[PDB]
Design a protein around this ligand. Structure first.
Ligand SMILES: Nc1ncnc2c1ncn2[C@@H]1O[C@H](COP(=O)(O)O)[C@@H](O)[C@H]1O
Ligand SMILES: Nc1ncnc2c1ncn2[C@@H]1O[C@H](COP(=O)(O)O)[C@@H](O)[C@H]1O
Ligand SMILES: Nc1ncnc2c1ncn2[C@@H]1O[C@H](COP(=O)(O)O)[C@@H](O)[C@H]1O
Ligand SMILES: Nc1ncnc2c1ncn2[C@@H]1O[C@H](COP(=O)(O)O)[C@@H](O)[C@H]1O
Ligand SMILES: [Cs+]
Ligand SMILES: [Cs+]
Ligand SMILES: [Cs+]
Ligand SMILES: [Cs+]
Ligand SMILES: [Cs+]
Ligand SMILES: [Cs+]
Lengths: 129, 131
């Protein structure tokens, strides 16, 4: 019923000072589509997100792939861990994103949810309609 | 509800001889996650697919992005244009992919369906639940 129950894994994240390639390596190594950029001082606070989609455009535009990742990162769209799952689903539909970052009431990184999680379960699909 | 009815765009494709960067440019230009690689002799026949996920690994492994795209591509997982939409959704789930290449009875490239198409419409979501 709620967001936290659909989380499969610990959050895949790097510090905000990470390079574009460093994010690319971390995404390939974990077989995920998005990486959360955490703050320097506080590794629990998500400051941005970087997707393979962002890296793809960096490749097409011929950016320095060893340059900083923050300039291609976006400000996180979030859902609470205590929120119902359909909120995460409609934010994805609304923002045309395939990920939502799950945080707690303190604003700390709990995990990341994917469109993959919501669509491939019959129990969820009937709720989201 | 059948795959051909959820098609809203002509297939984004390149010839199988395309480089990795040439695919990356095509993906960015069309704002899509996948590109279908078509045959040399017959551009209607899909021979492979390349996702931005594949390009991402190319970046991480420091491959020559001006090298050919075919070695980083995959054998196309297809669905018929006449097939019902739940079959396409079933293949995405089973094979852990977010795209399916829609072809016709002759095996020619009609279009490409995405997990984005199936999940962001209430009419479809309900039918995916009904089975
Ligand atoms: N940044 C992340 N941290 C932790 N788990 C993730 C992250 N991104 C995606 N996932 C999970 O890993 C699976 C595959 O990720 P994706 O290929 O990005 O959909 C999904 O079902 C998500 O639940
Ligand atoms: N939870 C999120 N918060 C902010 N931006 C996002 C989020 N998920 C995806 N994006 C952005 O949407 C684009 C592609 O996202 P995705 O569909 O997750 O690959 C990239 O430019 C991402 O930075
Ligand atoms: N290779 C392709 N050729 C034509 N249309 C596509 C292709 N890939 C995706 N689409 C469609 O265009 C949209 C692009 O989204 P996506 O590729 O999932 O980022 C999807 O909703 C599909 O309906
Ligand atoms: N229709 C398809 N047939 C074969 N492989 C695919 C298909 N769609 C995606 N893939 C592969 O699955 C991985 C993730 O693709 P995606 O998550 O759909 O961007 C990539 O390595 C793709 O090459
Ligand atoms: Cs940006
Ligand atoms: Cs609601
Ligand atoms: Cs929208
Ligand atoms: Cs977006
Ligand atoms: Cs149509
Ligand atoms: Cs491959």
């Amino acid at each position: 019923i709620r967001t936290s129950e659909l989380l499969k894994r610990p959050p895949v994240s790097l510090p905000e000072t990470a390079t574009i390639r460093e994010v690319a390596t971390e995404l390939a190594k974990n077989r995920v589509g998005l990486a959360v950029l955490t703050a320097r001082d506080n590794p629990k606070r998500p400051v941005a997100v970087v997707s393979e989609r962002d890296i793809l455009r960096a490749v097409a535009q011929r950016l320095d792939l060893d340059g900083p990742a923050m300039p291609i990162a976006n400000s996180p769209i979030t859902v609470l861990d205590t929120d119902p799952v359909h909120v995460a689903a409609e934010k994805m539909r609304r923002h045309n994103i395939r990920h939502v970052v799950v945080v707690n009431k303190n604003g700390e990184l709990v995990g990341v949810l994917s469109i993959r999680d919501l669509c491939f379960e019959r129990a969820i699909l009937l709720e989201l309609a």
